[PDB]
Amino acid sequence: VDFTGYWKMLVNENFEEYLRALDVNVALRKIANLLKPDKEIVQDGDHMIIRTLSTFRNYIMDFQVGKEFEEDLTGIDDRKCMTTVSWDGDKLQCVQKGEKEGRGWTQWIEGDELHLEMRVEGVVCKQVFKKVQHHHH
């Protein structure tokens, strides 16, 4: 599997409850739920860069698959986690060890769709991105 490309959000399902479960305050939940970030991904051997890009902010994950790293979620839910991203067959599985139980995500591809399930405390948010070709800085 190769996740490299540029991807545009098509749906974002149950995002509000996900953020509610991270204890994000009601006003930021409103701001956050309006954002439709693109995903720019470069898979370079086991080195993955995943840029979640929006006007409100860019969130950059830059990691080595299988190697735990310290993830600074300040500005999201104001936490830090020790995160590990691992291959689970054709799926990318992330566990974010920290204050919240069961926090992570799973990413996979179906045709020209990038699929992203985000999880915390038994709450699930599902996003789907379509692969696009128009790139502007």
Ligand SMILES: COCC1CCN(Cc2nc(C(c3ccccc3)c3ccccc3)no2)CC1
């Ligand atoms: C492979 O992608 C992994 C994903 C898993 C989820 N995190 C955290 C997350 N931030 C957000 C949004 C967000 C949530 C809360 C506060 C501010 C922003 C967001 C939107 C646009 C750019 C950056 C962030 N929504 O979710 C981002 C990377």
